[PDB]
C-alpha cells in the first residue's frame, strides 16, 4: 500500500510526536503535501511485519540499533545526502546509521541514560551503586525510597550489567563477532547479581516498570530514577526540583549505557522517497525543526552540530553526553534484537527467581548467539503449524518479518520436514 502523494511517519510514544507534527504542518503549508505522524505501540516490531509486504509508514523513527536488521532485510532505502549536508551532523552519527557501506537513515538525536535525582530529597546523589542500599534504608525510615527505574526493559538495566565487564558482541578485527557474546562473563554476572540483591533486599520491586517509576519520582516518592531526556518534560511539569548527572559507578567502574542514535529511516517500499528526503533534510534537520520536536519532548543531545552546540549550554545535556561518553554507541547489526530479547528474559527471570543469575545469563548467552533466535524460531513454528511448505515469495516474506536470511528460512523448513523411515 503506502499512498503516493503524502507522508506517514512512525515515532515512539515517549518522543515529541506532537512537535514533529508541527514540522509536518510547516511542510504541508510550503509544499501542499500532508504529513501524518503516528506513534504505534511496539512500532519497532510492527515495522518489519508490515514492511515485509511493502506496507507501513514512509518514514520510521527509532534508535539505530534496529536499523541494521531492517536494512539487511531490504526494508530501508539507501540515503545519499551531499557532502555539504553530511558535514552538518557529527561523523559518528552517520557511522551509526551506516550498514554494509550504505547510509540507511538520517541521524537525529544521541540518546544516553542519566541518573535523575530529587534535589530536595537528595542534594548530594551517590557516586556508587554500592551506596544505594544504605541510602534506601535511611529514606525508608522517612517513608521514601532511594531508587526506582524501569526494570522491564534491558535498556535501563544494561548500564549496570556492562559496568564491570559485560558486553553484547565482541568487536574483533573490524567487525562484531556474532558468536562471541559477553552477557555471561564475570562482569555481567556481578552486575546482575547486584541488581537482584537490590530486589532481594526489598530496595526495588521486580515489577517496577516505566510508568510506575516515572509516577513515583515525579511524585517525590523516590529520590532517584534512571531515564532519558524525553522524560525531562514530565518532570518539569511535576515541579519536582531535579538534577541530571553521571550514573553511579559499580566496582569502581562507570555505568556503561548503550548509546542510541534516534534516526529516521525511509521505507524501501515508499513511493515518496524524494518527499521524505526533502522533509528530513530541509525541514526536520534544521535548528527550527529540531527545536519544534524538542519543545514537545526533549530530544536530549542531537546529531545536528548547530543545534547541539546551543544545547551544550544546558548542564542536563552535558550530563547526557558525559554518560554517552562512558558507555558506547550500540552495534546496528541484525543480531541486536536477539541480544536485547536475551537480556530482557534473563533480567526478568533472575529478578523473579525463575532462574539463578548464572542460569539466566547462561541461557542469555546461548539465545543471543543463536543463528536463529528464539523469537525467530517461534515465528517459524507458528508458520509451519499452518503451512509446512512455502514458495519463494512466502519464504522471502517470512525472512523479512523474521529478521533472518531467506536461505535460513528455506533450510529450516527443509530440515524440519526431513524423515528417515
Helix axes 374-386, 392-402, angle to 10 degrees: 150
182: which residues sit within 8 A by CB, 6+ positions away? 165, 166, 167, 168, 169, 170, 188
Q: Are 51 and 267 in contact (CB under 8 A)?
A: yes
Experimental technique for the deposited model: X-ray
173 backbone dihedrals φ, ψ, rounded to 5°: -50, -95
DSSP state of 76: B
If you search the block for the grid coordinates 540499533, which residue do you land on?
A: 65
The answer to whether 112-259+332-370 and 371-421 have equal CATH topology is no
**222 - beta bridge partners?**
145
Report the b/e string of 303-338 with b at 16+ CB within 10 A. Answer: bbeebbeebeebebbbbbbbbbebbbbbbbbbbbbb
Using CA atoms, how far apart are residues 326 and 340, in angstroms rounded to an integer? Answer: 20
How many CB atoms sit inside 10 A of residue 141's CB? 8
By DSSP bridging, strand 35-38 and strand 258-266 are unpaired
Domain ranges of the chain: 5-111+260-331, 112-259+332-370, 371-421
What class is the 371-421 domain? Answer: mainly alpha
215: which residues sit within 8 A by CB, 6+ positions away? 221
Using CA atoms, how far apart are residues 71 and 358, in angstroms rounded to an integer? Answer: 34
Residues, the chain? 421
Residue 30: all three cell numbers together? 510550503
DSSP state of 295: H
If you search the block for the grid coordinates 542510541, which residue do you land on?
A: 260
**262 - beta bridge partners?**
63, 109
- Give the fold, CATH level 3, of 112-259+332-370: D-Maltodextrin-Binding Protein; domain 2 (3.40.190)
Nearest to 120 by CA among 23, 217, 259: 217
- Give the fold, CATH level 3, of 5-111+260-331: D-Maltodextrin-Binding Protein; domain 2 (3.40.190)
Helix and strand numbers (H, E) in the chain are 19, 15
The resolution, in angstroms to one decimal, equals: 2.1
Q: Is 350 exposed, middle or buried (0-12, 13-18, 19+ CB in 10 A)?
A: buried
Q: Are 248 and 133 in contact (CB under 8 A)?
A: no
Amino acid at each position: 500500500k503506502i499512498e503516493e502523494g503524502k507522508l506517514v511517519i512512525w515515532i515512539n510514544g515517549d518522543k515529541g510526536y506532537n512537535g514533529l507534527a508541527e514540522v509536518g504542518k510547516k511542510f504541508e503549508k510550503d509544499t501542499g503535501i500532508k504529513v501524518t505522524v503516528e506513534h504505534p505501540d511496539k512500532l519497532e516490531e510492527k515495522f518489519p511485519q508490515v514492511a515485509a509486504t511493502g506496507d507501513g509508514p514512509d518514514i520510521i523513527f527509532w534508535a539505530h540499533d534496529r536499523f541494521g536488521g531492517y536494512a539487511q532485510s531490504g526494508l530501508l532505502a539507501e540515503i545519499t545526502p551531499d557532502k555539504a549536508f553530511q558535514d552538518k551532523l557529527y561523523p559518528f552519527t552517520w557511522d551509526a546509521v551506516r550498514y554494509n557501506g550504505k547510509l540507511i537513515a538520517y541521524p537525529i538525536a544521541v540518546e544516553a541514560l542519566s541518573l535523575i535525582y530529587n534535589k530536595d530529597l537528595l542534594p548530594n546523589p551517590p557516586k556508587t551503586w554500592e551506596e544505594i542500599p544504605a541510602l534506601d534504608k535511611e529514606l525508608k525510615a522517612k517513608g521514601k525510597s532511594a531508587l526506582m527505574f524501569n526494570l522491564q526493559e534491558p535498556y535501563f538495566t544494561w548500564p549496570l550489567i556492562a559496568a564491570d565487564g559485560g558486553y553484547a558482541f565482541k568487536y574483533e578485527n573490524g567487525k562484531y563477532d556474532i558468536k562471541d557474546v559477553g552477557v555471561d562473563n564475570a562482569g555481567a554476572k556481578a552486575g546482575l547479581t547486584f541488581l537482584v540483591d537490590l530486589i532481594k533486599n526489598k530496595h526495588m520491586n521486580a515489577d517496577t516498570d516505566y510508568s510506575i517509576a516515572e509516577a513515583a519520582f515525579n511524585k517525590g516518592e523516590t529520590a532517584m530514577t534512571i531515564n532519558g531526556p524525553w522524560a525531562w518534560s514530565n518532570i518539569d511539569t511535576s515541579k519536582v526540583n531535579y538534577g541530571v548527572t553521571v550514573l553511579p559507578t559499580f566496582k569502581g567502574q562507570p555505568s556503561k549505557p548503550f548509546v542510541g542514535v534516534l534516526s529516521a529511516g525511509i521505507n524501501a517500499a515508499s513511493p515518496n522517497k524524494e518527499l521524505a528526503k526533502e522533509f528530513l533534510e530541509n525541514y526536520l534537520l534544521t535548528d527550527e525543526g529540531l527545536e519544534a520536536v524538542n519543545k514537545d519532548k526533549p530530544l536530549g543531545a542531537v546529531a545536528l552540530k548547530s543545534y547541539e552546540e546551543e544545547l551544550a549550554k544546558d548542564p542536563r545535556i552535558a550530563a547526557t553526553m558525559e554518560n554517552a561518553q562512558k558507555g558506547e554507541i550500540m552495534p546496528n547489526i541484525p543480531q541486536m534484537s536477539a541480544f536485547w530479547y536475551a537480556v530482557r528474559t534473563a533480567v526478568i527471570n533472575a529478578a523473579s527467581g525463575r532462574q539463578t543469575v548464572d542460569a539466566a545469563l547462561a541461557a542469555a548467552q546461548t539465545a543471543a548467539a543463536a543463528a536463529i533466535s528464539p523469537q525467530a524460531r517461534a515465528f517459524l513454528e507458528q508458520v509451519f503449524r499452518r503451512k509446512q511448505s512455502l514458495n519463494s515469495k512466502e519464504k522471502e516474506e517470512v525472512a523479512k518479518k523474521c529478521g533472518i536470511t531467506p536461505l535460513q528460512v528455506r533450510v529450516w523448513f527443509i530440515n524440519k520436514r526431513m524423515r528417515s523411515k
